[PDB]
Structures are given as C-alpha cells and as structure tokens.
Amino acid sequence: MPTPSMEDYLERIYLLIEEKGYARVSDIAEALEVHPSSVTKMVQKLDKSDYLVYERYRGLILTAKGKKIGKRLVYRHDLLEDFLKMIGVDSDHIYEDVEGIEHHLSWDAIDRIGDLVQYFQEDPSRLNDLREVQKKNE
Amino acid sequence: MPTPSMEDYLERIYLLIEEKGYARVSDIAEALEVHPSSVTKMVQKLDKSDYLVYERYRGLILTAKGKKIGKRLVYRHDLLEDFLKMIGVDSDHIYEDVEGIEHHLSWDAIDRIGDLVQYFQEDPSRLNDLREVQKKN
C-alpha cells in the first residue's frame, strides 16, 4: 500500500539515523533540494499510515513497520547493485539502473535475483565463466 | 532521443510489420489499448520526424531509422522476458515485470543481461545448479 516515494522517504530516514542518529525535515529538504513543506506533507502521509512519528526535539522516528520497510529497501538496493556489478554493467550506468528498476520489480523477481546473486558466490568460478562469455563476445 | 511513448509505439509497429508487412492503426490502438485518435496523433509525430510513413490502404511502414529502433526494442523486451523466465519468476508476474523495467535500464545493462542469458544457454547444467540454490533457499 505505500507508494514508491513513501518507501524512498523511509529508507532515507533510516539512513539519516544511520549517519548521525537523527532525521530532520530540514535534512531531507536539503538533500532533495525541495521545499520543506513538501517534506512535511510527505511526513504527514507517513505518520497517518503509522510508518513514523515526529517529536520536536528528536525529529523523525520510525515505527516498527516503518523501520522494517526502510531496512528492506537498503537491502534491495544492495542486492540489485551486487547483481548489476556481477553481470558487468559499467560504473557509468549502474547507479541509475539500480534506481530505475528497484521500484518496478516484484518481490518475487527481487528474490529470484537474490538466488542468482547467491548462485554466483556459492561456487565463485561461475563468475569467471560468465566473464569469459563477455570476453568471447568482444 | 525517442521518448518512452514513441518507443512503445515503435516496438508494437515493428512487431506487426515483421508479421504482416504493414501495421494498421486499428491494430495499434487495440494492442496499446488507446483510442484511435491518440494513435493518429502519435503517427503524425512519427511521420513528421521520419520514423515511418503511412501507405494508403496498407498502414504504416518504418523508415530505416524507425526499423532499426523498433527491432532493438523488440530484442530488449524479448531478452528481459527470457531473463525473467530463466531465473524462475512465476509466469503470472512476468508480463508486469518486463513492462515495469524495460524503460528503466541502460543498453549497457541490456547487453550484459544478454551475456547472462547466453552464459546459461551454453551449458544447461548451469540452470539446474541455479535451481538447486533456489529450492534450498
């Protein structure tokens, strides 16, 4: 039920607390280069749905459900980037490819990509076999 | 240069042409589930910039530019469809995953996914191994 942008907010809030222990509306407005009123509008939508609370002095605080979602999105990002690096996407394209597909994949496809990323590591000579296919095509 | 919308039209037009020599506007409207009036507007944009021509009592033909683009777009859709099947996405989310992602991947990524699909075709025991990682979970 959360929109993609709502997920992006919860992940960004989780990562602000990872960075300095607190998440501020001004932090998000500055990182996004948007007006703080659009951040407070999004925060209100996340509050109303019990993904976070706000207290004056402590700032934005994730609920159990909000923190569950934020962490999952960090992991999905890490997983998709592992995948694209494994198959050889160059450093010019990999960041926007990860951002591009992370909200347009079913969790089924995310899980299947996870199995793929695990497969190339359980016997890492699989990765060298893959690199050789790419070399042969050049 | 071609927008996502243009690409969606070019890909469908190429599929009809490769199958029937010409793409009819009526077939394009039903396939894309848009009103014929929207197709007409898109056709005039593509005609004016030389992606296609309209031939009376036949339909649309792609120019060399339009054809080279529509071919590459069909390849991308087919490769992503193959890639998702191969890694075990259920058949009842495949269509939605392909359309959700096809406008969001560099051609660099498409090429590498091609190399990946090729890796699994050159030795079909690789796919059996992949399946054992997934059933073990």
Author numbering:
A (entry chain A): 1 to 138
B (entry chain B): 1 to 137
Can I see the authors' text?
The structure was refined to crystallographic Rwork and Rfree values of 18.9% and 22.9%, respectively with good geometry. The C-terminal region of chains A (residue 139) and B (residues 136–139) were poorly ordered, due to lack of electron-density maps. There were few structural differences between apo and Mn2+-bound dimeric forms, with a r.m.s.d. value of 0.49 Å for 276 Cα atoms. When measured between the Cα atoms of Lys41, at the center of helix α3, the domain separation of apo and manganese bound BhMntR are 37.4 Å and 37.5 Å, respectively, while the distance between the Lys41 in apo, Mn2+-bound, and Zn2+-bound BsMntR are 39.2 Å, 32.1Å and 30.7Å, respectively. There was little domain movement between apo and Mn2+-bound BhMntR, possibly due to crystal packing or the presence of positively charged ions of Na+ (~0.5 M) and Mg2+ (~0.4 M) during the crystallization process.
The manganese transport regulator (MntR) functions as a homodimer and is activated by Mn2+ to repress the expression of two manganese uptake systems, MntABCD and MntH, in response to elevated concentrations of Mn2+. The MntR homologue (BH2807, BhMntR) in Bacillus halodurans is a protein consisting of 139 amino acids, and has 78% sequence identity with MntR from B.subtilis (BsMntR). Each BhMntR subunit was composed of seven α-helices and two β-strands, which could be divided into an N-terminal Helix-Turn-Helix (HTH) DNA binding domain (domain1, residues 1–71) and a C-terminal dimerization domain (domain2, residues 72–139). To further understand the metal binding site of the MntR protein, we determined crystal structures of the apo and manganese-bound forms of MntR from B. halodurans.
